[PDB]
Design a binder for this molecule. Structure first.
Ligand SMILES: O=C(NC(=O)c1ccccc1)N[C@@H]1O[C@H](CO)[C@@H](O)[C@H](O)[C@H]1O
Ligand SMILES: O=C(NC(=O)c1ccccc1)N[C@@H]1O[C@H](CO)[C@@H](O)[C@H](O)[C@H]1O
Ligand SMILES: O=C(NC(=O)c1ccccc1)N[C@@H]1O[C@H](CO)[C@@H](O)[C@H](O)[C@H]1O
Ligand SMILES: O=C(NC(=O)c1ccccc1)N[C@@H]1O[C@H](CO)[C@@H](O)[C@H](O)[C@H]1O
Lengths: 811, 811
């Protein structure tokens, strides 16, 4: 149908059809009379999967012969989503499969909807890992993603009576055709025990053993015949485990619980033992695998020349003392040499400055679970603090501030401090964030070792986030500037010469309208909700957090409603306001915010005076597959975090690439997005970081805003009196109390500027031609935000490897 | 190489080779440079498996069109063993695969050794189910085996310091290529809750739900293109299970524990809740599946014309009240009609008369777990006892004896009584056993309903137990009488005309010697034990039980040793005495017997005066795959249970078919084996059932035998003094005490006749020609003991279906 989806050649389609039929018979053990849509999906998945095999074997064989430096990306989260369409895109098989299935009497799009998301992540951090894997393969790097194979990913969200309910995400129920179990490469992991000091070094003895069984998933590069590996570890009990008899067998579950479920808490560090076990489990298994592969290439001087380990946040921070343990205790290297190797191989990426999210493990927990690692951490700290003392003599408070060991009620280990000490590179994820790191929370470390601190602005893959989810837009772009931009997104700048092109303006606007109609139809079929497709699609999708300020959005929505009720016969630009995202199960306030959104919808969506001029919809079960549907349909992207709180954001970049305009604060990557597009083409509002600081010095008093802004007063009175909860008048008292007395994120302070800015958005939307011209200016300058750019920078500036766009020979 | 293994045609071998290479690449994701023997096994398994697919689909399609009466074999155990060779045999692919692998540079026999046994059974009962499945497919019956997919089968046995250690049998570690998961056919099973009585009948409410997910395994018939199904249920938690959040997800394991592990206790009924859950789980899921299939064929009058349910022991006895529950509560049939249907569809097979093994469930357990079923059981009992009262007026003691409800300390339900009441047929498993049932434990029921009671003498499949495990013997037989005997074992009678054939005598003896050399070599390689291949191979392999009298064997072994020590320079026929079998983990005495056997070996095997004239070896980890190795190598089969205790035995039949002579009591099928072969060709000794009864009337006094037999006295003094345990002198005091004071099985009473009979065995072995002639007379009369004969009798006399040897059309 469309050019970017590849060729549908006669021999290719014929071969695909017969292999589809073969799999339906031999693999699924079905025939056409009894086969269901799910069976057809699996037949297609196996057919496409076959095409990865030759490329996967020869890519890994190529790395063995060429022996390049290997990149190991360690993360507790890989938010992969669906794999079928992505695989077809990267292999140039999409049109061929579309034709093959069509001739079989099947709709491929219908089959694609059957696939479960691999939801092995919470949000931004997990999805970054996934985009990074795609970019590393596309850029021909010898890269490996290492994580945990959770049997249950992020929970499925159900909304019941307006409240979030959590349901287990049993994603493996029907099987996962994309993984390959490798039980032959199973490795032991040790827990508990004690440390013995013999004449020749320390010995970690009397340990409990849990086995780590790897599952490998292929990661294809874009049309370059490279297929890299994501290896995820699964926990298995040893066969002599606990070995009355029946109970011993049943107790195997305790060991295997390590890989059972993804921790869904992305707001607050809890310090749970099971989470610590997960973190060590992934680290210990991975490092054995790394060292094994290195020895197959005696002397560890060359280790950093052949290995780079990237730590995605502090979650895999135990890699640092584990590498030291292996080098000192097992390989018998001297401490100083081992430390040199460790620092040169490890690098650390930070994703937040909010203190409550930072990992600070109780010493008593590490003492019991990982006694040797605690000893190593103490020695690292002692040697590090001796360096600080030499550099800043007499500065005793610096010594307490920089210590890896935090004193107090319970002694804790600061894992961020551990990461800085043991890494040659530390990076933030957007320019403003990386600057905040150097100026605030890591200032002491920056003064000691300035050379360690870097910026690597986040990005998104244009394969999933344009070609896959928005083929209409990809096609009209390709018509003008060709196909090269898909792996070189900076070429989008060439679209600036089409900003006054009447045909292109019409085409961009047409694609958006079709996307909106498609999504409006999806909402009616799968959720039975009715929306006006001609309204402005106002979208805020992301995890529910106070700092992300879904509440500020809520205040604007109520303002719009109240203004309509005040002047019903006055014209307003029609809006569909969509808010979606999951709340961490233990995050009370976030759960209350979800309830508020639905409660507003109940009032607004059923007011006859409002009509179809304003709709408020909560998007249930927001996840990667839903993002691929809603983002291409959006007109307005809400990126409204308090300045200095969102490290980068990546949803923002997805919206920019897909033809939405952005209303946002100068926070995270928003700053660089406005810089690229021009501030005139962005709807910037609110306090800058400096303004937040000034307000903090004075002390934030919300009552002042309440007293001075009558429209704000009305809303708070409505919330307090039970206007949005007639049966439970005091339902939202927790929300009001927080806003008035304990609001860390200064919602009221940005209210006036936000409302005014929103008026300017509505004014532009009244002029379709000028709206679209501004959209073109955004799409055309989105190039910087390709994860290909991001990865090239990691490669050159941290890992010491050169990216390559050169094809591997076709199988 | 040999004729019975089929043709190796040029096109067949070429096709097998390319499909092997295809699977190695696309299925295993390996190449020849990195592939291990395990990879090659899996490539071969997938290649052979492909050949089952077409036949499996069309067999099941054939049953849909023809709509025959369906046979449902319900068992908690299916002791399947390995599948690769059996599949090749039944599909006539063995020679073709042997050639294909040879040309690839691989040894197929080496690859076969990699496959794990599917050890989903304890012993005889589980293995009978497996032979029955093979025979039902071979005889073209529309039969389905229904059971549980245990993740852990019967434990692997390790011997450490002479003691049994149990190790988890993680048989699914590398995957099971022979199963097909069918998550689409998942069914709910209910537990706990309460009963509500509404205007229209009873209602079972507030239940806990566990899901039953089916896995299907193909069961190919012998060269008839029939492929039946064994469906095994796996336990899954519902997704809203327990749905702080993390704990709810982790608690899913509790529901899924139902299918975790096979209960290894085959001696004593324990009354554990988890076992009751397993029993209901299999019954509830199976019956839904049965009814679903029946409705697809409103009126249940035809149900018994289209459905037969065979209960393998009382383990699936809950089928009776569950069928009543569905018919009365859900289908709204009147009680009398439902009862008529139930009786006509159900049949029950008993496997032991020993009281301690009989299932008698505490009422309080059923009350909590299955409250509706308890109510139904009470009503069944009340109506049954009303029939007894009418038939035998005034006989109040008969009323208490026949009741399904047993009074006492704790009230219990007798599941055997439930089975008799609710079945149209009740059978024992050998003629003597079926007679004992009518005369003793079920006498009251026989007097009430004589027509219900039948015999069905057990059998073994000649595919696994001759063609597969002893191709040498199969071949020399085929040379004389052709191949028809493999599916018509009665044709073995034709070998009687070769008893004086000098060539045949030589060939039979040659095959046995080759088998003995092969097994002697296996022992050296995998266990490092050395045996004389020229010695008489004296074998007792079966589960360790007091009634099976491994202890009597032990006494003979010590007698032989003592006699050698008495007269060292006197000639004795050299013997290798091999004893093997697992003990139930909680069976103390059985564990002591294993220790005794190894303790005897430690003394005997290291006495220089003995030399190679006597060796005592304990065969570790006895299982189906080991049976296939040891049985063809045996000269003497030990079948020495106390008369009236072994219901049938099936190991006995395996030895007879493979050229061993039998030393045995007149117990179980031994009686019919001696009848078929002639008593002159069997080594029969010891008390008959009548003699045991007479001794019981007098009272058994072991001291009498001790006082009168000096050779017996010596042995007991050796055991007591610490001759076989120098470091722990009183180690065997429990064994001596039992023998002297509390021996239920009268070991001493058969000692003298046993020793004398063993002398007659040694005398015959000194005459190789006459030994082999007697062997020929045994093999030639083993025809009756084919499970094909057994199944034909079940079909005609219980199920009301006609067997068929007619081929289904080739795919
Ligand atoms: O799970 C996979 N996955 C793949 O083959 C694969 C191939 C390419 C890309 C991703 C997965 N293969 C599986 O390997 C097992 C064990 O050997 C087989 O029994 C099974 O038939 C096969 O599907
Ligand atoms: O998503 C997370 N964090 C988590 O999901 C998380 C998970 C476990 C514990 C704490 C936080 N952080 C997010 O990481 C992305 C990628 O750099 C940024 O764009 C975003 O600003 C940040 O908040
Ligand atoms: O497990 C089986 N078994 C069989 O195909 C089979 C065929 C014949 C006989 C026995 C098993 N097939 C499996 O079905 C899953 C889910 O559809 C696939 O992902 C996998 O590749 C395949 O091996
Ligand atoms: O094997 C068992 N029983 C068990 O394995 C068992 C299992 C669980 C609970 C009780 C007994 N019984 C055996 O069943 C076979 C087949 O009919 C007979 O030949 C044999 O005589 C009998 O002891």
């Amino acid at each position: 149908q469309i050019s970017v989806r590849g060729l549908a050649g006669v021999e290719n389609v014929t071969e695909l059809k017969k292999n589809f039929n073969r799999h339906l018979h031999f693999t699924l053990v079905k025939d056409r009379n009894v086969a269901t849509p799910r069976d057809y999906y699996f037949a297609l998945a196996h057919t496409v999967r076959d095409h990865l095999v030759g490329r996967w074997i020869r890519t890994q064989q190529h790395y063995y012969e060429k022996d390049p430096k290997r990149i190991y990306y360690l993360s507790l989260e890989f938010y992969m989503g669906r794999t079928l369409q992505n695989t077809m895109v990267n292999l140039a098989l999409e049109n061929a499969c579309d034709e093959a299935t069509y001739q079989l009497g099947l709709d491929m799009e219908e089959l694609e909807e059957i696939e479960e998301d691999a939801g092995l992540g919470n949000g931004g951090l997990g999805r970054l890992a996934a985009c990074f894997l795609d970019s590393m393969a596309t850029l021909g790097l010898a890269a490996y993603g290492y994580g945990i194979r959770y049997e249950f990913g992020i929970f499925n969200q159900k909304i019941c009576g307006g409240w979030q309910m959590e349901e287990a995400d049993d994603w493996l129920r029907y099987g996962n055709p994309w993984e390959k179990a490798r039980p032959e490469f199973t490795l032991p992991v040790h827990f508990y025990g004690r440390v013995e000091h013999t004449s020749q070094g320390a010995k970690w003895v009397d340990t409990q053993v849990v086995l780590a069984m790897p599952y490998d998933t292929p990661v294809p590069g874009y049309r370059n015949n490279v297929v890299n590996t994501m290896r995820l570890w699964s926990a298995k009990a040893p066969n002599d485990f606990n070995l009355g008899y029946i109970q011993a067998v049943l107790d195997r579950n305790l060991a295997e619980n390590i890989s059972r479920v993804l921790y869904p808490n992305d707001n607050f560090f809890e310090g749970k033992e099971l989470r610590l076990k997960q973190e060590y489990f992934v680290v210990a298994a991975t490092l054995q695998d790394i060292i094994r592969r290195f020895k197959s290439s005696t002397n560890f001087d060359a280790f950093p020349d052949k290995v780079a380990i990237q730590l995605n946040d502090t979650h895999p921070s135990l890699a640092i003392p584990e590498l030291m343990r292996v080098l000192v205790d097992l390989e018998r290297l001297d401490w100083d040499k081992a430390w040199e190797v460790t620092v040169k191989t490890c690098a650390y990426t930070n994703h937040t400055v909010l203190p409550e999210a930072l990992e600070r493990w109780p010493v008593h927990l590490l003492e019991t679970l990982l006694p040797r690692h605690l000893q190593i951490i103490y020695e690292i700290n002692q040697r590090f603090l001796n360096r600080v003392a030499a550099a800043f003599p007499g500065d005793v408070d610096r010594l307490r501030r920089m210590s890896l060991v935090e004193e107090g009620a319970v002694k804790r280990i600061n894992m961020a401090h551990l990461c800085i000490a043991g890494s040659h590179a530390v990076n933030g994820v957007a320019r403003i964030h990386s600057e905040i790191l150097k100026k605030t929370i890591f200032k002491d470390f920056y003064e000691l070792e300035p050379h360690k601190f870097q910026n690597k602005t986040n990005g998104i893959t244009p394969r999933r986030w344009l070609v896959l989810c928005n083929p209409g837009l990809a096609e009209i772009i390709a018509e003008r500037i060709g196909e090269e931009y898909i792996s070189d997104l900076d070429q989008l700048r060439k679209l600036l010469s089409y900003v006054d092109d009447e045909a292109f303006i019409r085409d961009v606007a047409k694609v958006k309208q079709e996307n909106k109609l498609k999504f409006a139809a999806y909402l009616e079929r799968e959720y039975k909700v009715h929306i006006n497709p001609n309204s402005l699609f106002d979208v805020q999708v992301k995890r529910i957090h106070e700092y992300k300020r879904q509440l500020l959005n809520c205040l604007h929505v109520i303002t719009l409603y109240n203004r309509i009720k005040k002047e019903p016969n006055k014209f307003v630009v029609p809006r569909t306001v969509m808010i979606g995202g999951k709340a961490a199960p233990g995050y009370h306030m976030a759960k209350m915010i979800i309830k508020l959104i639905t409660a507003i919808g109940d009032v607004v969506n059923h007011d006859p005076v409002v009509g179809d001029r304003l709709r408020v919809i909560f998007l249930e079960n927001y996840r990667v597959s839903l993002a691929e549907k809603v983002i291409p349909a959006a007109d307005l992207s809400e990126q409204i975090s308090t300045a200095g709180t969102e490290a980068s954001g990546t949803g923002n970049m997805k919206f920019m690439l897909n033809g939405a305009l952005t209303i946002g604060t100068m926070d995270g990557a928003n700053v660089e997005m406005a810089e690229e597009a021009g501030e005139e083409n962005f709807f910037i509002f609110g306090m800058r970081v400096e303004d937040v600081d000034r307000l903090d010095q004075r002390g934030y008093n919300a009552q002042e805003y309440y007293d001075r802004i009558p429209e704000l007063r009305q809303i708070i009175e409505q919330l307090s009196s039970g206007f949005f909860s007639p049966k439970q008048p005091d339902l939202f008292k927790d929300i009001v109390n927080m806003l008035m007395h304990h609001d860390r994120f200064k919602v009221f302070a940005d209210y006036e500027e936000y409302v005014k800015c929103q008026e300017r958005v509505s004014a532009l939307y009244k002029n379709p031609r000028e709206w679209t011209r501004m959209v073109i200016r955004n799409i055309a300058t989105s190039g910087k935000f390709s994860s290909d750019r991001t990865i090239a920078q990691y490669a050159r500036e941290i890992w010491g490897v050169e990216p390559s766009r050169q094809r591997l020979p076709a199988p």
